[PDB]
Amino acid sequence: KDWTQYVNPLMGSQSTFELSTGNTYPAIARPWGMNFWTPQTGKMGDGWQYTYTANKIRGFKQTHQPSPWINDYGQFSIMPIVGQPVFDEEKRASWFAHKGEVATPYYYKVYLAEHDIVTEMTPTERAVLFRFTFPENDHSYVVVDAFDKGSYIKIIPEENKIIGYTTRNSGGVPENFKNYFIIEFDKPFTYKATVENGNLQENVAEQTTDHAGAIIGFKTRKGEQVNARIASSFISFEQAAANMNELGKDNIEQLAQKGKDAWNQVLGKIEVEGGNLDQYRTFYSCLYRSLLFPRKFYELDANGQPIHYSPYNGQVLPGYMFTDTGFWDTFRCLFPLLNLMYPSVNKEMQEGLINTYLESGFFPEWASPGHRGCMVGNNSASILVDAYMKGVKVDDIKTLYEGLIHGTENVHPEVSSTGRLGYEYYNKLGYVPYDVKINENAARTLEYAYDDWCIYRLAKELKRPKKEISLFAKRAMNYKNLFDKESKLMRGRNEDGTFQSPFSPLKWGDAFTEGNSWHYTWSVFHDPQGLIDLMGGKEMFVTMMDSVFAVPPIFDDSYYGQVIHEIREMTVMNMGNYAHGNQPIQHMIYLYDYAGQPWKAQYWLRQVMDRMYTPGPDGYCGDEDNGQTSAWYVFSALGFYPVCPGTDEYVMGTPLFKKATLHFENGNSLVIDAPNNSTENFYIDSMSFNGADHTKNYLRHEDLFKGGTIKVDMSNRPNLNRGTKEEDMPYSFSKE
Ligand SMILES: [Ca+2]
């Protein structure tokens, strides 16, 4: 059975600075691969390294980039050309068309029209094989570009080899940062030149310079194939040579089959059927995008044991390491998806986090590859705790707990999004104030309160002193400190305790991030009942919820002075103020379940799935955000979602397919059977779990893992009675 046929690596590529439909590039890679490869249409340095509307490719590039905003590191490219040996990234570039291109996760091919050259590539976790098919020509070349900001290159003709290192990066790296690469050709060089700050230096073997490059060449006959085996390491040249062994002596066809198999192994853990082709493509493309980040950042020693270059301190050290994710995005459902479907993989990642804390003094929030200043919150706490409570348990629990506590009373001296900026005010006042020069203060406070609930959970589980458990149980309620009873919304609060005026509920940023009050107010994952209580009961809560959808997409952009692309993206979708791309709001629709109206979740969730995601190049309604926006679709299509990681619950939405089968790593399987599902029948009339009537609006992790059958009776009419009882409600801390 193949699922890769449904994966479109071009989904999200039709994006620009001005307007996102995913801001992705085609990651040709193994799952969680250390090195990704992509065709490169953008100029060196441009975060938009591949865009669908671009006409020319100027290299095939090794990349580690998680988003255009974060940008790249450990990057170099290769480009086959004919005619004159030219290094310049414009002069060497070639027209292509998407109809001369084949993009899959395990194999990429393109016809370079201006050189009459076909390029094919098939990666492994750390290496890749290139096959170039050249035309008849006296002057055929391959250009190797080590990029700028200080690089190195060496041509070794007696070995048909080129080695080099690249350092261009976007921050978050140690001083000794390098990515060492080795390229072996199966055709010997008849022409050889290094490049030094744009000057071709024929027969000069080596360069150490700002922007090193190499051009080798030969005569080719029509249809002549030249293969290049490439690997890189963050450790050393000898380690890169070891990494090359992943290629064995395989050809393109053999490596493509191994990558296809690797992908089918992970994609095939979730088998959907009884939908249409657009849905299959959307689903598996989103699943593919959910299994890329964070990437492996470890390599294998002579004994097959993991070692890694430390992006935190520059040492080479034993153990697992992963990077390139922002927990502000990925705590929400991306990491939970791994705890459900791929826990063995998150086990490695969690050990990597322990290594991050050991190496750098902090758990990461945004890492690429080292600590990076981006977004907000202490959501590493959610990641660590959710794993543990779901049985993904690190070896050194003591260090894990100490790391967590460390993060509640420290902020990283250089990277303000690492640790807790404003923790002094928060610990003292119960909130980060609006008028103390700490922006995003309300968003930080709300996420910290949830984060402290996660810590409370773990402290209780670990049998910590009652004094510690009480501290964090109290901090978990800090969300109440920003609730404005007058507007029924969250509101920035001055240091002196008064709420800030004038108050603008539609103003994006400022007190919040990636949205306004209407978007962030719902960020009480651990205590929705508490929020319902604050607003005066379930009827008023639903009145407020419903109003998000019913109003026009009006906004206040005065924080920015202009309509930023995230605001534009909301305005065009015809969903009121529900801006699906803003991460803080993505769990929102599930909250209808907690207010006794699950049928409203069913209605709106289905609207989002049918309208906000498409399988084409312009697929997503905003940035994909390293798996979070994709994993949202994966979960929601199955019919449930981890509103509150750290609990064992998935909150019920509405399934998209007539049938979905989950295959768990523990060897058990779960069938979600919804035979009456259709475009019209998106309401849950009733539901059973292994035959037992199930009116609850949540499912438990442990019960799913036991396997069996969930049967969902789908209807075109809402069932106004199902899921409204007290015992049907998912978890709230206030009730606990
Ligand atoms: Ca977003």
Q: Strand 669-673 and strand 708-715: pairing?
A: parallel
The reply to whether 215 and 317 lie within a common domain is yes
Phi, psi of 419 (to 5 degrees): 75, -160
Rounded distance between C-alpha atoms, residue 706 and residue 699, angstroms: 12
Beta-carbon neighbour count of residue 529 at 10 Å?
A: 20
Phi, psi of 256 (to 5 degrees): -60, -45
Q: Using N-to-C axis directions, what is the helix angle for 466-475 and 441-461, rounded to 10°?
A: 150
Rounded distance between C-alpha atoms, residue 363 and residue 261, angstroms: 34
The reply to whether 393 and 460 lie within a common domain is no
Look up tokens 């306004």; give the residue.
Answer: 516
Q: DSSP assignment, residue 329? A: H
Separation of CA 264 and ligand 1 centre (Å): 28
Task: Count CA atoms within 13 Å of residue 312 on its CB side.
Answer: 25
Rounded distance between C-alpha atoms, residue 257 and residue 254, angstroms: 5
Separation of CA 327 and ligand 1 centre (Å): 13
Separation of CA 580 and ligand 1 centre (Å): 8
Q: DSSP assignment, residue 43? A: P
Rounded distance between C-alpha atoms, residue 344 and residue 323, angstroms: 17
Confirm if 512 and 484 have CB atoms less than 8 A apart: no
CB neighbours of 596 closer than 8 A, spacing ≥ 6?
538, 723, 724, 728, 729
Rounded distance between C-alpha atoms, residue 189 and residue 72, angstroms: 31
Rounded distance between C-alpha atoms, residue 325 and residue 341, angstroms: 19
Separation of CA 582 and ligand 1 centre (Å): 4
Separation of CA 678 and ligand 1 centre (Å): 29
Separation of CA 520 and ligand 1 centre (Å): 13
Confirm if 90 and 211 have CB atoms less than 8 A apart: no
Rounded distance between C-alpha atoms, residue 201 and residue 689, angstroms: 71
Separation of CA 234 and ligand 1 centre (Å): 30
- 2 annotated to a ligand binding site: no
- Could you say which of 397, 419, 441 is where a domain stops? 419
The reply to whether 532 and 618 lie within a common domain is no
Separation of CA 558 and ligand 1 centre (Å): 20
Separation of CA 579 and ligand 1 centre (Å): 9
Separation of CA 69 and ligand 1 centre (Å): 12
CB neighbours of 24 closer than 8 A, spacing ≥ 6?
11, 12, 13, 15, 289, 620, 624
Helix (H) or strand (E) holding 685: strand 683-689
Separation of CA 189 and ligand 1 centre (Å): 48
The reply to whether 429 and 576 lie within a common domain is yes
Q: For residue 690, give the 3-state DSSP assignment.
A: coil
Separation of CA 20 and ligand 1 centre (Å): 10
Confirm if 86 and 92 have CB atoms less than 8 A apart: yes
- 88 annotated to a ligand binding site: no
Separation of CA 711 and ligand 1 centre (Å): 33
Separation of CA 566 and ligand 1 centre (Å): 8
Separation of CA 622 and ligand 1 centre (Å): 6
What is the domain-level CATH number for residue 340?
Answer: 1.20.1050.60
Q: Using N-to-C axis directions, what is the helix angle for 628-638 and 598-611, rounded to 10°?
A: 130
The reply to whether 497 and 593 lie within a common domain is no
Phi, psi of 342 (to 5 degrees): -135, 50
The reply to whether 258 and 367 lie within a common domain is no
Resolution, expressed in angstroms to one decimal: 1.9
Rounded distance between C-alpha atoms, residue 567 and residue 579, angstroms: 8
C-alpha pair distances (Å), 201 with each of 204, 307, 330: 6, 38, 47
Residue 649 tokens, joined: 């619950």
Closest CA to 583 of 334, 408, 385, 392: 334
Burial of 334 (0-12, 13-18, 19+ CB in 10 A): buried
Separation of CA 98 and ligand 1 centre (Å): 28
Confirm if 28 and 105 have CB atoms less than 8 A apart: yes
Beta strands in 370-494 (DSSP E): 483-484, 489-490
Separation of CA 585 and ligand 1 centre (Å): 10
- Could you say which of 365, 386, 419 is where a domain stops? 419
Separation of CA 263 and ligand 1 centre (Å): 26
Beta-carbon neighbour count of residue 639 at 10 Å?
A: 24
Task: Count CA atoms within 13 Å of residue 151 on its CB side.
Answer: 31
C-alpha pair distances (Å), 136 with each of 54, 96, 130, 151: 28, 19, 19, 33
The reply to whether 361 and 466 lie within a common domain is no
The reply to whether 155 and 298 lie within a common domain is yes
In b/e form, how buried is each residue of 5-26, taking b as 16+ CB within 10 angstroms? Answer: ebbbbbbbbbbeeeebbbbbbb
Closest CA to 697 of 725, 662, 669, 734: 725
Task: Count CA atoms within 13 Å of residue 703 on its CB side.
Answer: 13
Confirm if 647 and 658 have CB atoms less than 8 A apart: no
Cis? peptide before 502, omega within 30° of 0: yes
Rounded distance between C-alpha atoms, residue 520 and residue 569, angstroms: 17
Residue 291 tokens, joined: 């299994």
- 685 annotated to a ligand binding site: no
Look up tokens 């441009």; give the residue.
Answer: 46
Separation of CA 367 and ligand 1 centre (Å): 17
What is the domain-level CATH number for residue 10?
Answer: 2.70.98.10
Separation of CA 488 and ligand 1 centre (Å): 25
Confirm if 636 and 586 have CB atoms less than 8 A apart: no
* Residue 711 lies in domain: 270-293+589-611+613-728
- 582 annotated to a ligand binding site: yes
Residue 555 tokens, joined: 């906004």
Separation of CA 614 and ligand 1 centre (Å): 17
Rounded distance between C-alpha atoms, residue 206 and residue 165, angstroms: 12
Separation of CA 329 and ligand 1 centre (Å): 8
Helix (H) or strand (E) holding 213: strand 212-220
Closest CA to 190 of 169, 163, 217: 217
Beta-carbon neighbour count of residue 84 at 10 Å?
A: 11
Separation of CA 223 and ligand 1 centre (Å): 46
Separation of CA 632 and ligand 1 centre (Å): 12
Separation of CA 505 and ligand 1 centre (Å): 19
Q: Strand order in 698-700's β-sheet?
A: 640-641, 649-652, 698-700
- 514 annotated to a ligand binding site: yes
Confirm if 320 and 355 have CB atoms less than 8 A apart: yes
The reply to whether 305 and 213 lie within a common domain is yes
Separation of CA 613 and ligand 1 centre (Å): 14
Separation of CA 629 and ligand 1 centre (Å): 8
Q: For residue 614, give the 3-state DSSP assignment.
A: coil
| Total count of domains within the chain | 4
Rounded distance between C-alpha atoms, residue 508 and residue 558, angstroms: 8
- 577 annotated to a ligand binding site: no
Confirm if 159 and 183 have CB atoms less than 8 A apart: no
Separation of CA 624 and ligand 1 centre (Å): 7
Rounded distance between C-alpha atoms, residue 197 and residue 708, angstroms: 64
Residue 686 tokens, joined: 């009733």
Separation of CA 616 and ligand 1 centre (Å): 19
Task: Count CA atoms within 13 Å of residue 367 on its CB side.
Answer: 32
Q: Cα-atom radius of gyration of the chain, to the nearest Å?
A: 26
Rounded distance between C-alpha atoms, residue 169 and residue 72, angstroms: 6
The reply to whether 594 and 663 lie within a common domain is yes
Separation of CA 451 and ligand 1 centre (Å): 20
The reply to whether 414 and 461 lie within a common domain is no
Rounded distance between C-alpha atoms, residue 265 and residue 16, angstroms: 33
Q: Using N-to-C axis directions, what is the helix angle for 380-389 and 343-360, rounded to 10°?
A: 130
The secondary structure of the chain in percent helix, strand, coil, rounded to multiples of 5, reads 30, 25, 45
Confirm if 515 and 579 have CB atoms less than 8 A apart: yes
Rounded distance between C-alpha atoms, residue 505 and residue 625, angstroms: 25
Confirm if 319 and 306 have CB atoms less than 8 A apart: yes
The reply to whether 246 and 280 lie within a common domain is no
